[PDB]
Amino acid sequence: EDMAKIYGAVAAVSKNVNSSVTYEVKRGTHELIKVPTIPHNLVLIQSDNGK
């Protein structure tokens, strides 16, 4: 019985080993919007007689 306790404690220590890490790489990334129209900013000014 006391041997099972000693053997169990050793197995607990051996099981404390770490395997790996996992993380997401998202820094520096931004979403993109879509502009549907082109701004021209033009107006045609014409006289009444058209000259």
Partner: protein, 50 residues
Amino acid sequence: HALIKEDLGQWPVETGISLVNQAGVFAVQLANKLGIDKPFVLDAGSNYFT
């Protein structure tokens, strides 16, 4: 066809860690199954017929 199979059970083994440490845990359970953990003396002398 016939065969003789010895069934000592199934014991899971985990990889990546020391095997000897897992064997020690299973050793006490195996001894419990065979009834040899505690001090014993075998009496099988009367298990016979003529």
